[PDB]
Design a protein around this ligand. Structure first.
Ligand SMILES: CC(=O)SCCNC(=O)CCNC(=O)[C@H](O)C(C)(C)COP(=O)(O)OP(=O)(O)OC[C@H]1O[C@@H](n2cnc3c(N)ncnc32)[C@H](O)[C@@H]1OP(=O)(O)O
Ligand SMILES: CC(=O)SCCNC(=O)CCNC(=O)[C@H](O)C(C)(C)COP(=O)(O)OP(=O)(O)OC[C@H]1O[C@@H](n2cnc3c(N)ncnc32)[C@H](O)[C@@H]1OP(=O)(O)O
Ligand SMILES: *[C@@H]1O[C@H](CO)[C@@H](O[C@@H]2O[C@H](CO)[C@@H](O)[C@H](O)[C@H]2NC(C)=O)[C@H](O)[C@H]1NC(C)=O
Ligand SMILES: Cc1cc(=O)oc2cc(O[C@@H]3O[C@H](CO)[C@@H](O)[C@H](O)[C@H]3N)ccc12
Ligand SMILES: Cc1cc(=O)oc2cc(O[C@@H]3O[C@H](CO)[C@@H](O)[C@H](O)[C@H]3N)ccc12
Ligand SMILES: *[C@@H]1O[C@H](CO)[C@@H](O)[C@H](O)[C@H]1NC(C)=O
Ligand SMILES: *[C@@H]1O[C@H](CO)[C@@H](O)[C@H](O)[C@H]1NC(C)=O
Ligand SMILES: *[C@@H]1O[C@H](CO)[C@@H](O)[C@H](O)[C@H]1NC(C)=O
Ligand SMILES: *[C@@H]1O[C@H](CO)[C@@H](O)[C@H](O)[C@H]1NC(C)=O
Lengths: 547, 540
């Protein structure tokens, strides 16, 4: 009867001279038009009020505006938050007319009941099952006999955490609203992994390129390697990751040109080529002081910083200045019914227009993140053309983190000072941009547009994560990234694998109740743990696929 | 138009007045098919103007049209014809009871013109495209530079040929009827692949066991390797290869336990454990010592063959004749609607259930069988083991007389002749008649002997040319031969992916399907070649 995060609302109209219409709009909508929930009729006779059944969304909040089809006057505005499976009864009576809320069945309290208790129980059960399976393997072997520079590992732990979170939220994340990507604006747990992947990509770009150059290899061989790696990423993404082959053979008239791997390849090429051309040897003798307050890692890359600033200015100018036909200039909203629905075919503004012009409507993402909340009827691709500038900026921030990590290697206090300084600077910039509020600010945090505040917020998060991880996993040694670094070293293999093997049995099976959050959560956690186990097994076999 | 692929539009005109003629159709190749109703032709309203009926006769190979009156059923005209693709044939039955077969539009061959000269044309096209891609890609790099224990390779070539055939016929094989699996009895191009894979599997089993036992190891880590490889093959077959995950998530109640890789794993375990349990070291014009040293496993193979024969021809099956080999459905005059496989089908449905079996057997499209019958069932694994052991015998022949090439060809010719004689004795040189007709779905003993004789002849041809005389390394073939498992898993996983599958301008065209499948097979050969160059052979 009811679906996930969907309370059942019954409207009892005790009125006898009005045809009430209940409207609806979530709290998380910024400026959304009210959608008709159900059209309750008037009571034919006194004593027996007219009733109708409506299913209200539970994910986050609910605004119910009561209007009558005759005069269109707000008899009462009710603003509540519903539960996952709740028999809610709304009665409105003339006393003038006030609508009161009654609960006939208590909600399941989605994400309230599971909390950390169910997660700990599931983890214990999975660990016990794995240990029992491992012990059973030795039982068969016994019965048969009876019968007859190195890797940082902190960047690796960072990438492993990002990969685990990405595998969890890509498989559904328990079908929870906050483990999915945000509709248009703000941040969720699924909006963090991709920026961290670009950050780590830039960091590893600098680490690998400087290792290769100081190992005595020509810059042209590295240029060829970079070009081949970016081309392979783009082709792999376009041919394998982007299209859903369960719907039929791939036709060029509906091929999704831009994607996650295409974005990664393009920004890899751009920022890696920037580093290659403007490559200076890593200074070593300069690290002779104690906690040196030198800006060497920044002033040694003034041309790349100038190019990055020019690119960021280009992104800001195109976003806020490019005149989109039939659209306000500098439009950042979601379109659809968002922003009071006055721009329905304007999902993404300048970035969406650039994508639709250069690549066409059919070569974009047909199911954007905003399509489920703001009801966008057009196609917008989060990995568009305009957002690649901000992805390049993020990759260069990762490059800066790598320069911090390598220029000062012996002085771990210097590394921590630089990480804290950069995290604070980027956090202050993000707070200034987004104005702390989710939907307010000059450039609100947005994954779909890859907003500048999105880049800065996620880069500050990445700098803080590196600040926490580098001493613990490298200097102090209190933790080896025990379950995380195997995905860190098999990132590309795990990404291609889980984007290819989404529907295979160990990662996805038929569920007893498809509308249960706990069943989906168990399936997604088991699938993520199995991908970690696969990465660990390949680590033991020393099978590291690299492009 | 409304005509499909491999179908012909048959217009029927009845000049008869007091007739309610119905047209019954039955494909020529079916052994004993009930005449299904094709179309119902109504009585002509008046003289001069006959009633017209539109039908699509399956022109894959032949068609039998029988016309008997609807009321007081009596045949008025029995017509046998071999229709052509996209043919507009008009049937004119007129009162004189006479028949006419006027061809209103000439048929399109779509088989000779596409697979006779268009095959060579497409080969030239793909060769030119590959050469241009190789030259242009290196030209750009050159512009920048200017500006600034041994493997035999015969078994490898055999396995590569089998892999090329499997990739071609698994993708559709041009959607031709002879590049698919024959509906129950008979041998097609697609039926030749799996038995050769089992044969090569057994040959490689012996060729690896001999090397390992001669080197430093024991028959206790070899047993672990064999058991783990069998378990891995079975698990891969159950999880990855078998289910069609595009439909939805896997479920226990509707998961297909049998499979190609499950069958390969079970037969590998059985035959490899047999050789390990009876492992002897290698030591001749007519020595025959290879068949005598391996006498216990030959005795066990004969016992297993007797068991398969006894279960097939003697196991009682409820609601089914004892010793049934027929396809069921409308086959055998439809007297056994649900008897697909007989003993093998009943054993599968009794041990694994009817939901853990192949729901689209090759007999469904022609004999109209509604039950689920799995070609890789439980009964046929005995014959899979027998053919794997014939491959093991080929390996023993090849390894025992390594320095006596003439001995190798003498033994290969002798074994091929013996197995061919056994096959022609069992099938009486007829696909549907005989004692044990050739059948992939039952994995018949005559199927095993025929395909093993074919494999022995293929080895007899390949071994001198590719090993002894050295005239031709298996240049377009052994590259998949060295990556078989990866190639199989890859084309099972990446069936729908762009290089191997793209949307066609008209899905009802044999030329477009053939070119797409040839391009896909060539791309898989190219992938295997690239992996060979980089030495990324995946094993176990
Ligand atoms: C939002 C959602 O829900 S979807 C989330 C989106 N998901 C994704 O984008 C996942 C896909 N991306 C990825 O898997 C990765 O980011 C990749 C593969 C594209 C790039 O990973 P990278 O950071 O380039 O690392 P990778 O493992 O490929 O190695 C690249 C180079 O960096 C080097 N490197 C990596 N880590 C380190 C380290 N810690 N120290 C030193 N060198 C390192 C490697 O040695 C290699 O150089 P080499 O070949 O010369 O030896
Ligand atoms: C009919 C249709 O359309 S669908 C049916 C078609 N599909 C199938 O049959 C499934 C696909 N099958 C296959 O890919 C293969 O048959 C496999 C992988 C299952 C088995 O291949 P095999 O012949 O066993 O060889 P594989 O490469 O796996 O290695 C087996 C062993 O034989 C050895 N070997 C292989 N070829 C040779 C050779 N020519 N000489 C000596 N030893 C050899 C290998 O070295 C290996 O031993 P090792 O572990 O010491 O290295
Ligand atoms: C529900 O009723 C209220 C009040 O009747 C509507 O509020 C006004 O509606 C008129 C249109 O009749 C608009 O011109 C006004 O701008 C609205 N606001 C105010 C403050 O007057 C409300 O629009 C109705 N709901 C919907 C979905 O239209
Ligand atoms: C749920 C899901 C199923 C699937 O079959 O695979 C996915 C792949 C995903 O990845 C995202 O997909 C969109 C465009 O690719 C963008 O929202 C993001 O940028 C990108 N990280 C996200 C979700 C899924
Ligand atoms: C169509 C298809 C696509 C693919 O990519 O994979 C296949 C693999 C096939 O092989 C057959 O599959 C069945 C066993 O699973 C049995 O009909 C036969 O024994 C076996 N020859 C046949 C068809 C396909
Ligand atoms: C309410 O709508 C019904 C039809 O659905 C109509 O018969 C009735 O007159 C309406 N009442 C008012 C007060 O408009
Ligand atoms: C909800 O409650 C009402 C009365 O309180 C009852 O009639 C109805 O059956 C209930 N529905 C569900 C789904 O529990
Ligand atoms: C058509 O009629 C003839 C009349 O004897 C009969 O023998 C034949 O079986 C009929 N065809 C059917 C029933 O398919
Ligand atoms: C077959 O020929 C008839 C001639 O009477 C014609 O009307 C019909 O359209 C033809 N079929 C097709 C598919 O064109």
């Amino acid at each position: 009867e009811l679906k996930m995060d969907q309370a059942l609302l019954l409207i009892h109209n005790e009125l006898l001279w009005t045809n009430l219409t209940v409207y609806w709009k979530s709290e998380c909508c910024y400026h959304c038009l009210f959608q008709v929930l159900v059209n309750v009729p008037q009571s034919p006779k006194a004593g027996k009020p007219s009733a109708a059944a409506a299913s209200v969304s539970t994910q986050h909040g609910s605004i119910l505006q009561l209007n009558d089809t005759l005069e269109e006057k707000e008899v009462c505005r009710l603003e509540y938050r519903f539960g996952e499976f709740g028999n809610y009864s709304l009665l409105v009576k003339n006393i003038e007319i006030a609508c009161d809320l009654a609960v006939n069945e208590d909600p399941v309290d989605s994400n309230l009941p599971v909390s950390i208790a169910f997660l700990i129980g599931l983890a214990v059960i999975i660990v016990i099952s794995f240990l029992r399976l491992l012990l059973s393997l030795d039982d068969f072997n016994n019965w048969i006999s009876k019968a007859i520079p190195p890797r940082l590992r902190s960047v690796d732990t960072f990438r492993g955490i990002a990969l685990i979170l990405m595998v969890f939220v890509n498989y559904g994340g328990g079908k929870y609203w906050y483990f999915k990507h945000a509709s248009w604006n703000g941040l969720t747990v699924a909006d963090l992994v991709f920026p961290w992947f670009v950050f780590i990509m830039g960091s590893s770009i600098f680490l690998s390129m400087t290792s290769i150059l100081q190992r005595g290899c020509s810059k042209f061989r590295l240029l060829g390697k970079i070009a081949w790696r970016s081309f392979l990423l783009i082709c792999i993404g376009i041919i394998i990751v982007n299209p859903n082959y369960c719907l039929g053979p791939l036709s060029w008239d509906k091929v999704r040109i831009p994607g996650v791997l295409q974005r990664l390849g393009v920004t890899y090429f751009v920022v890696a080529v920037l580093e290659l051309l403007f490559a200076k040897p890593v200074p070593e003798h300069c690290a002779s002081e104690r906690s040196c307050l030198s800006l060497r890692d920044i002033t040694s890359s003034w041309p790349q910083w100038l190019l990055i600033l020019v690119l960021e200015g280009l992104w800001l100018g195109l976003t806020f200045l490019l005149p989109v036909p039939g659209c306000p200039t500098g439009y950042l909203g979601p379109g659809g019914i968002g922003d009071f629905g006055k721009y329905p075919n304007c999902t993404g503004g300048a970035a969406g227009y650039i994508d639709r012009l250069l690549l066409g409507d059919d070569h974009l993402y047909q199911h954007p993140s905003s399509a489920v909340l703001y009801h966008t009827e057009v196609a917008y691709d989060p990995e568009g053309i305009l957002g690649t500038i901000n992805s390049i900026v993020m990759a260069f921030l990762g490059v800066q983190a790598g320069k911090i990590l390598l220029y000062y290697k012996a002085r771990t206090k210097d590394i921590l000072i630089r990480f804290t300084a950069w995290c604070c600077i980027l956090g202050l910039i993000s707070v200034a941009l987004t104005k702390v509020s989710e939907n307010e600010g000059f450039i609100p945090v947005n994954k779909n547009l890859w907003s500048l505040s999105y880049v800065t917020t996620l880069s500050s998060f990445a700098f803080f994560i590196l600040l926490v991880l580098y001493p613990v996993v490298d200097v102090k040694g209190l933790w080896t990234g025990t379950p995380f670094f195997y995905p860190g070293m098999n990132s590309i293999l795990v990404y291609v694998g889980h984007e290819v093997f989404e529907n295979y049995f160990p990662f996805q099976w038929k569920l007893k109740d498809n509308q249960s959050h706990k069943e989906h959560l168990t399936q997604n956690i088991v699938a993520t743990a199995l991908w970690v186990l696969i990465a660990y097994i390949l680590y033991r076999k020393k099978i590291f696929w690299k492009i």
